[PDB]
Design a binder for these strands. Structure first.
Ligand SMILES: Nc1ncnc2c1ncn2[C@@H]1O[C@H](COP(=O)(O)OP(=O)(O)O)[C@@H](O)[C@H]1O
Ligand SMILES: [Zn+2]
Length: 700
RNA sequence: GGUAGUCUACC
RNA sequence: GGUAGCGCUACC
RNA sequence: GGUAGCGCUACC
């Protein structure tokens, strides 16, 4: 039974004409009800007319998959079979969706489905191409994520291949594309004309010409989704007395550690003067983010530079590692107070004490009691945060508080602080911390229930609770010195359906928030221009649509000419263990398989220790992995990668962070962060074949 | 960082 | 293990 | 616009 509202029916009109469209409506307006109605009309008209029908509904986050699948399925007759597909599944996708009418999927499942046929171990293993046009209608939930190299963008890439190459099979037609979103975003453009072009580009890439926007029933929409006021509350940042002394004394300690590096670089006769190429003087402002840019990029040079004396690499990597912890220590002092920041620093420094060098143990003893600095007052943001909690708890004993922070560790700290707060202890208010699941989901679900029952009344969370999760309506939303984009600004305040308040001690963070409100009104102005000058907008879409196919071909041509040139250079790279530098193999021995990079040198098995995973753990993991491999050399044991099952055979893949490249015939030490950087700059492994699988199955 | 445009000072 | 996006920042 | 670093989240 469908009791469709009036503004919802308005949002179905374009789609019900069979046209591609994007549905823009606030979060909580019932877009999945709109989709369910469109799927119903699509299924019934086409079934009665004898035409084929098959729906696909995609959403980026797999946690609201059963929720949105059950919702849509409930509005449809039982003759229509619905099926969820996701990474936790073990059966191939091709079979699961064979006789299903509604597929509910994460978009990568469809990317792999459509690209699965392009690679094979041999000609007999080849698969028939699964054409995206097998679906007659496709829904992009949160379609503002159709940008750059995203899964959604790669699904539209398949669409445009079919649209321009004319390879669709007999009877097929281009599917109807429907997008759902609360806001398409401004692309951080500065005026309406540019934002209109940006939106035209997004439409073009989805092959959309007509936006679906509530125009008549605007008042009915206001009632069903109110306007929440977003207040900003700037707080004082203390730099007086103990707090400034802790900062000043930790700054002097870092300058001494920076001297350990310089004394070492002098012995190598290396002259100091970007920080990933040249050795540079550290920035004077130690707590500025530009300092971490220096420490981290410099540490890449230390493992990518060939020294000449003994221990130079050891003392520098020891120094840079301490400076990282000092920078984070300064960062934790901004959000809290020197007690917490020193607690972190003491633990980190005590952990490394057994291994510290001579010079480093001397420096720490000279500052460990000095940095103490007795004790300082509570951070103004904490006290102001507590004040907001008490003000709501007096008005309502059923008070639900959720606090967004930036880092996982900051949630750990703020949680421990709020629980040890005397005024909250008496007032009967416990707090729990929550973070992202990707690196137990049941231990997290347990916290959401306790938060709903009222056992815990405060929830310190990272940005995980901004989308997807079913978090109960909260009385107060606090953004503890944290802000990001304008799309989350519309969906971070959208969780209040209640007051959201930004507590910050940074003007740059207040400005970032006010800019995101300007972007919100800039969207309104632009959407109005689009609605009221529809012909000009159509011309913008046509201009952008004219660019897509030649751009796709240019991109494909660039990839092929890049491989062509790499083959003409014909450079061989030695692949060594990053820790022990034992030669693991060469680039000629690497093969690729589902964007995994496998060693196909049979001698490689004798350089590693396999470590299998139990079938219990494998079922929980949402990708292909059977175990790990570790460097076999003595006193190394570095994890070099993982085992993946290829046609029943375990094969070893290499982690990019566990290896270093050497041009064959030189000592040139190339460091790499990701395999995609290797494919882009050095060599492109060819697809793994059946011969390679057998050769490694036997050698093992 | 590159380009286009404008301004200001100077031969 | 691989990949995607977002924020901030550094250098050109 | 390009080249990098950190943090966050997600996906296979
Ligand atoms: N017309 C309606 N009839 C019944 N329930 C509705 C209606 N519109 C919205 N809802 C309910 O509102 C809730 C949120 O809707 P949802 O589709 O998740 O919104 P969106 O996906 O646009 O954020 C759902 O539980 C849904 O059942
Ligand atoms: Zn090793």
């Amino acid at each position: 039974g469908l009791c469709l509202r009036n503004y919802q029916e308005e949002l179905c009109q374009v789609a019900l004409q069979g046209k591609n469209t994007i549905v823009t409506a606030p979060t909580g307006s019932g877009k999945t009800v709109i989709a369910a109605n469109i799927i119903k009309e699509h299924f019934e008209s086409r079934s009665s007319e004898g035409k084929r029908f098959k729906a696909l509904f995609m959403t980026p986050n797999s946690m609201i998959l059963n929720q949105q699948a059950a919702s849509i399925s409930s509005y449809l007759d039982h003759v229509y079979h619905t099926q969820i597909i996701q990474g936790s599944d073990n059966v191939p996708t091709r079979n699961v969706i064979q006789s299903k009418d509604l597929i509910v999927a994460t978009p990568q499942m469809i990317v792999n489905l459509c690209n699965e046929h392009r690679n094979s171990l041999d000609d007999e293993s080849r698969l028939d191409q699964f054409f995206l046009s097998t679906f007659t209608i496709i829904f992009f939930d949160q379609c503002h994520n159709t940008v750059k190299n995203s899964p959604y963008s790669n699904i539209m890439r398949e669409y445009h291949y079919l649209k321009n190459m004319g390879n669709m099979p007999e009877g097929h037609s281009l599917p109807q594309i429907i997008g759902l979103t609360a806001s398409l975003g401004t692309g951080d453009k500065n005026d309406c004309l540019q934002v209109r072009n940006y939106i035209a580009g997004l439409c073009a890439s989805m092959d959309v010409k007509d936006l679906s926007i509530v125009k008549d029933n605007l008042e009915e929409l206001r009632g069903y989704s109110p306007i929440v006021p977003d207040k900003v509350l700037l707080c004082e940042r203390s730099t007086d007395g103990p707090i400034g002394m802790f900062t000043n004394r930790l700054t002097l300690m870092m300058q001494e550690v920076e001297g350990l590096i310089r004394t070492a670089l002098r012995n190598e006769h290396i002259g100091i003067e970007r920080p990933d190429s040249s050795f540079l003087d550290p920035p004077a402002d130690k707590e500025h983010a530009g300092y971490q840019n220096w420490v981290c990029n410099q540490m890449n040079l230390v493992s990518g530079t060939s020294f000449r004396e003994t221990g130079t690499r050891t003392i520098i990597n020891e120094a840079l590692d301490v400076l990282k912890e000092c920078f984070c220590t300064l960062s934790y002092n901004i959000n809290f107070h020197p007690e917490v920041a020193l607690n972190y620093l003491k633990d980190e420094m005590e952990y490394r004490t057994p291994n510290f060098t001579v010079n480093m143990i001397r420096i720490w003893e000279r500052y460990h009691n000095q940095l103490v600095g007795t004790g300082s007052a509570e951070n103004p943001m904490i006290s102001k945060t507590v004040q907001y909690i008490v003000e709501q708890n007096l008005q309502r004993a059923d008070s639900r508080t959720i606090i967004f922070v930036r880092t996982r560790y900051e949630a750990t700290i703020l949680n421990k602080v709020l629980n040890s707060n005397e005024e909250l202890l008496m007032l009967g208010i416990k707090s729990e911390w929550m973070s992202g699941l990707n690196k137990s989901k049941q231990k997290q679900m347990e916290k959401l229930k306790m938060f709903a029952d009222g056992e815990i009344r405060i929830l310190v969370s990272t940005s995980v609770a901004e989308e997807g999760l079913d978090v109960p309506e909260c009385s107060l939303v606090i953004k503890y010195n944290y802000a990001t984009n304008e799309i989350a600004h519309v969906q971070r305040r959208g969780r209040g359906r209640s007051e959201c308040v930004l507590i910050t001690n940074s003007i740059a963070l207040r400005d970032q928030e006010s800019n995101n409100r300007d972007k919100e009104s800039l969207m309104s102005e632009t959407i109005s221009l689009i609605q009221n000058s529809p012909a000009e907008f159509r011309k913008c879409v046509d201009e952008e649509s004219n660019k897509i196919w030649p751009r796709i071909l240019r991109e494909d041509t660039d990839k092929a000419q890049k491989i062509e040139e790499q083959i003409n250079r014909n450079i061989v790279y030695k692949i060594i263990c990053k820790k022990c530098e034992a030669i693991l193999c060469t680039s000629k021995d690497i093969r690729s398989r589902n964007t995994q990079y496998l060693v196909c040198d049979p001698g490689f098995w004798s350089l590693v220790r396999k470590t299998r995973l139990t079938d219990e753990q494998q079922a929980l993991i949402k990708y292909n992995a059977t175990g790990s491999i570790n460097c076999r050399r003595e006193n190394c044991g570095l994890k070099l990668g993982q085992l993946i099952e290829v046609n029943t055979v375990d094969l070893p893949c290499l982690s990019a962070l566990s290896i270093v490249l050497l041009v064959e015939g030189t000592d040139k030490r190339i460091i790499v962060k990701k395999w995609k950087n290797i494919l882009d700059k050095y060599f492109t492994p060819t697809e793994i074949r059946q011969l390679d699988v057998q050769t490694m199955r036997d050698a093992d």
